[PDB]
């Protein structure tokens, strides 16, 4: 319900953060 | 624009229960299952076990288990309480109009139905101590109890709180059987308002048929004469003196009921100096220090005591009572002048018809009357009733207090305080 | 029907050599907890002996006498009736919360 | 309490009435 | 019949003006007894720090004698009539009212009437109401409950009028002479800042004969030069804590910076105070109850009791929760408490919203039963809001409200913002303002 | 300040009854005795001794004892009833102490009330008193015959009176008490204001103004 | 206390007196 904006965001850091890292 | 005011129907069924429904066209609803049940139909052995029944209202039931009870109740916004006096148990339940049945099935579920589980009940008895403890902050209600205590002998010195010895003691199989004695057919009474006539009956019939052992007669109010002092060392000096009044039903009612309102019964105005109240002006000219004085006045549809409540410091409380006793003493010979009485009836009248203004203390006198009489007699009756009241009446009933046997009850540091006797 | 293999996995089981009931061998876990705890003082006082006597056994490598052994017919399900209930009612709170 | 101001209407009003509930606090009424 | 339809069915309130400036209102019933009186828009935000503490003598001092009626003709004349006189003091707004039989409307008024425009202020009797408020600020001293609400004030508005107790500090009361009370009676007493309510068995256009007949005798307009208005007052996060082990339990007040009188949100902000509840040790429900916080509370002990509270102003307001607990329950508390307000912020349910909607439902129709509470409603409702609010209108406001809506509020006044906390008694445990700041946004 | 004397034992008359919830019933009924000082505390402490004062014969059944004979042939319980005695320098209590349980408090308290008036009204051989008299003085020679029941004694006496009486003084005290004054004393009981302390569960436990 | 035999002797045989020490147990002698 609340979590799916959430959990998508976080999804993105997740995504990008690996993204920057290697 | 003004609405019509309908009639508060009646109906009494076979099996003895009294049904009153009030169709308010109101937003909210009150309903309320009223049972002569309370301290006093408790005895030697079994103590306490009102006040853990009062307390266990949202305990699981063989309809509905705690957890329902709570949660569906809270959930349509409603409330279910409990009023126990020393004679009657008022099961109450408030909701929206929408709403009804279902708050009404929670309140059959509790009063005809309900299984007191041993881990329950057990889970439940340190509640008893802490609701106990709470109510006893108060110091009055503490005084009370001593007074009713040291009043009578059987019936009505039951206290009202659960003895202190007996907290944890109250079984599952004594709540059982106090429910199986007494919330019967003959002994209980429903009470509606915001809900049809019809439906409130139907219900009466379909759910509220159990019917068993002590119906109905009663226990007999032995009336005694009794002190007991508890040494406080408390700020104030708090104490109560009584004699035997009369029960509910007479006309005497009415007088010692107008005898309070002639006396000083309760301040009106918010910081004033107590005008009108008679105990306050005559304790006020002899001692000058901070005090309060006031006329206490029970009656039951077996008995009734009336007298004065006194509160003050150390050495006053000696003067306070004996200048409110003489004070007492001087209207019971004839010293009453006609506008005393003819303020103290419009008082009266204008109280009771302001108690009966809310709809919860509306719904408490309806019970009150469908329990007490087994009928109805609306306000107009009582405004006449209080007005029919004689001075002859007035002085008898002051007379009465002066003549009867004593009943005293004090808490505080009493060292300069007296006994009955010493009166 | 099958009774006898029921009977035959009892003996097979072998907590009755022991001197245990069923109920005695059930895994803790909240709802066996709850129902343990809502046990009256005589059923959960012999339980405790029961255990505390089946441990002791256990200990020792040894088994009771063949008579003092638990009989599939006197095996009471004493437990069962008040962890049926506590399942019911945390079922009851879990459809509840549902909704 | 303190004062008499204050400690007027403290004395009994009525015999009390203990009333427990699901929802609203335990009062003692009169 | 339904609910809806009953709302709908309900007396409808009616208003009239006086050509100099008083508001006059009615709810008319078919009740006998009736309640009747005079709000006024006046108390500790209006004072200053030269006279604070007016209002609340002024209060002190109403009831003895007026100037018509001396010493305590006025106290016989209400006792022996069979009717009750009171009054108090809000921030924000004074009133005094009578209450009556419906028969006695014209002599209510008319004392009413009385008490406001004719006051002796006898010199005697005020170096007496000084000891009596002396006495009293002791009295206030002592109770813990309020105590904390005055701090949380104090604290929240610091450096504003709001900040102030209506009571006032001790050396106002001390040293305020009849000058400052009869100033701020001929200011802040009139007609255009006052209103007349009723409410029970009357008929409007008699009561309107009647506020004709003895109220339209107050001034209507200004000397051109000195009429307050009011300056909207600061918020400030920020910390009280006022240590003190002697005392028995803690007590904690939280709040963060309110809507206002006027903003819709305060129905939205009613059904989220309704959600978390309130609780207290002598509740039946305990470990079953809805609001998580009540049922943890109740099952681990953690509170005495706990209330949410919207104490609402002209402009700005305090939203937030009060709690009393044992001093090793203090940090426990405030987690769960804040918990519930992230929680209620980011996800609430739609049944919870439901239930905290007919809490308010139930609180409006519990709350206006009686002539006293509906006067006050009256009242009240005028000085603020402008006009009676229908009980249809607020079901509207209660019915526009769902989850998404209490989200989109509680997270607009709550997530991420400095709350206003006051604590007072043995407060070791009460968590460190940073603390508290970094729980008021979450993880997330 | 204060300097010796004292104030005043003023004697009233009261019942308080604590509700106990336990196994047995405990109880005492008493009125104003005489003061320590005169031949009346004698007399009293003799009537003690003819009524039950308290048993000698280990596991007897009270045989001598008068108030449980009177008890025992009433009603047929688990019971005990013993005669209590206080004398001070300033005042005095007489009368007895029961314990039963919850019905029998009502019977054991009356049949050892009616027994004591019995003896008020005038039943009273002359060997009874003469036993009484016996084991009240060998009573008090076996109380002194310790020396920390001695110095108790002469230390009671230094205060009581100023003064120091032998035990000898103390036999011919008790040996002149005339059956006057055990019947005279005996009759104060009775006629004097009455005194109730109760605890236990109380239901069938009467109060003072139902003896 | 369960039989009339141990029963006898434990009604009051004279006025409580309280004993305390710095060796001996504390006592309510009759």
């Known amino acids: 319900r609340n979590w799916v904006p959430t959990a998508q965001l976080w999804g993105a850091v997740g995504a990008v953060g690996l993204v920057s890292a290697t | 624009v003004p609405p019509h005011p309908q009639d508060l129907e009646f109906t009494r069924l076979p099996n003895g229960l009294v049904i009153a429904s009030l169709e308010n066209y109101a937003p909210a609803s009150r309903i309320g299952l009223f049972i002569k049940a309370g301290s006093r139909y408790e005895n030697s052995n079994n103590l306490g076990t009102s006040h853990l029944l009062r307390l266990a209202s949202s305990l699981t039931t063989k309809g509905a288990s705690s957890f329902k009870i709570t949660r569906g109740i809270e959930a349509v916004g409603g409330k279910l309480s409990v009023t126990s006096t020393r004679e009657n148990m008022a099961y109450t339940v408030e909701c929206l109009r929408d709403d009804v049945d279902i708050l009404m099935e929670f309140l059959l579920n509790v009063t005809t139905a309900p299984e007191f589980r041993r881990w329950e009940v057990a889970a439940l008895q340190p509640q008893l101590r802490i609701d106990k403890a709470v109510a006893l902050q108060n110091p009055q209600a503490h005084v009370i109890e001593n007074l009713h205590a040291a009043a009578y002998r059987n019936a009505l010195a039951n206290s009202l709180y659960c003895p202190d010895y007996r907290i944890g003691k109250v079984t599952p199989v004594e709540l059982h059987d106090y429910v199986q004695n007494h919330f019967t057919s003959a002994r209980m009474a429903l009470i509606g308002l915001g809900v049809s006539h019809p439906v409130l009956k139907q219900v009466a019939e379909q759910f509220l048929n159990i019917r068993g052992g002590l119906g109905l007669s009663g226990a007999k109010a032995k009336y005694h004469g009794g002190e007991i002092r508890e040494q406080n060392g408390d700020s104030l000096v708090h104490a109560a003196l009584v004699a035997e009044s009369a029960a509910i039903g007479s006309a005497e009612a009415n007088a010692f009921s107008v005898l309070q309102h002639v006396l000083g019964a309760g301040p009106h105005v918010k910081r004033g100096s107590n005008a009108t109240s008679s105990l306050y002006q005559a304790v006020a000219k002899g001692v000058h220090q901070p005090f309060d004085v006031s006329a206490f006045n029970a009656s039951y549809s077996d008995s009734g005591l009336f007298g004065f409540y006194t509160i003050s410091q150390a050495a006053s409380a000696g003067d306070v009572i004996k200048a409110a006793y003489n004070q007492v003493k001087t209207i019971a010979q004839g010293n009453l002048s006609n506008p005393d009485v003819q303020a103290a009836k419009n008082k009266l009248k204008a109280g009771y018809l302001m108690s009966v203004e809310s709809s919860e203390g509306f719904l408490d006198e309806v019970g009150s009357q469908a329990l007490a009489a087994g009928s109805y007699t609306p306000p107009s009756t009582v405004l006449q009733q209080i007005d029919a009241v004689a001075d002859a009446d007035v002085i008898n009933a002051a007379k009465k207090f002066v003549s009867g046997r004593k009943s005293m009850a004090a808490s505080g540091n009493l060292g300069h305080t007296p006994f009955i006797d010493e009166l | ?99 | 309490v303190l004062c008499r101001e204050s400690l007027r209407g403290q004395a009994a009003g009525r015999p009390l009435v203990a009333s427990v509930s699901l929802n609203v606090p335990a009062s003692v009424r009169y | 019949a339904t609910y809806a339809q009953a709302l709908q069915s309900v007396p409808e309130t009616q208003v009239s003006q006086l050509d100099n400036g008083l508001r006059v209102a009615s709810e008319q019933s078919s009740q006998p007894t009736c309640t009747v009186g005079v709000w006024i828009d006046a108390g500790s935000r209006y004072e200053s720090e030269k006279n604070n503490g007016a209002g609340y003598f002024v209060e002190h001092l109403a009831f003895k004698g007026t100037k018509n009626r001396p010493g305590n003709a006025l106290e016989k004349e209400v006792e022996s009539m069979g009717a009750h006189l009171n009054a108090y003091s809000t921030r924000e707004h004074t009133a005094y009212y009578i209450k009556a039989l419906s028969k006695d409307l014209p002599k209510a008024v008319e004392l009413l009437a009385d008490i406001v425009q004719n006051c002796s202020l006898e010199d005697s009797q005020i170096e007496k109401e000084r000891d009596v408020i002396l006495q009293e600020l002791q009295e206030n001293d002592t109770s813990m409950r309020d105590v904390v609400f005055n701090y949380l004030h104090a604290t929240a508005f610091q450096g504003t009028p709001l900040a102030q107790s209506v009571e006032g500090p001790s050396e106002n009361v001390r040293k305020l002479s009849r000058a400052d009370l009869t100033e701020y009676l001929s200011r802040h007493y009139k007609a255009p800042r006052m209103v007349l309510a009723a409410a029970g068995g009357l008929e409007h256009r008699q009561l309107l004969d009647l506020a004709q007949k003895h109220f339209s005798g107050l001034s209507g307009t200004y000397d051109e030069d000195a009429v307050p208005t009011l300056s909207p007052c600061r918020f400030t996060g920020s910390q009280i804590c006022h240590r003190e082990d002697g005392l028995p339990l803690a007590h904690v007040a939280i709040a963060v910076e309110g809507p206002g009188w006027a903003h819709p949100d305060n129905v939205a902000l009613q059904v989220a105070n309704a959600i978390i509840g309130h609780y207290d040790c002598t509740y039946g429900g305990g470990a079953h109850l809805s609001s998580p916080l009540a049922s943890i509370a109740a099952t681990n002990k953690l509170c005495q009791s706990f209330q949410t509270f919207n104490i609402c102003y002209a402009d700005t307001g305090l939203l937030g929760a009060h709690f009393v607990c044992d001093h090793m329950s203090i940090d426990d508390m405030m987690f769960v408490l804040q918990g519930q307000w992230m929680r209620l912020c980011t996800s609430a349910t739609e049944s919870e919203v439901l239930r905290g909607k007919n809490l308010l439902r139930n609180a409006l129709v519990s709350h206006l039963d009686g002539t006293t509470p509906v006067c006050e409603d009256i009242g009240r409702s005028l000085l603020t809001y402008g006009r009676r609010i229908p009980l249809a209108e607020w079901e509207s406001r209660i019915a526009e409200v769902d989850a998404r809506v209490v989200r989109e509020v509680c997270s607009k006044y709550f997530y991420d913002q400095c709350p206003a906390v006051a604590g007072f008694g043995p407060i070791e445990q009460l968590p460190d303002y940073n603390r508290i700041r970094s729980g008021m946004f979450w993880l997330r």
């Open chain 3, 1 to 99: 029907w099958l009774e006898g293999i029921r009977k035959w996995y009892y003996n097979a089981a072998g907590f009755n050599k022991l001197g245990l009931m069923r109920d005695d061998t059930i895994h803790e876990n909240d709802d066996v907890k709850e129902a343990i705890r809502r046990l009256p003082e005589n059923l959960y006082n012999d339980r405790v002996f029961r255990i505390k006597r089946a441990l002791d056994l256990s200990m020792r490598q040894q088994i009771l006498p063949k008579e003092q052994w638990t009989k599939y017919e006197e095996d009471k399900s004493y437990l069962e009736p008040y962890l049926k209930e506590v399942i019911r009612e945390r079922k009851e709170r879990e459809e509840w919360a549902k909704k």
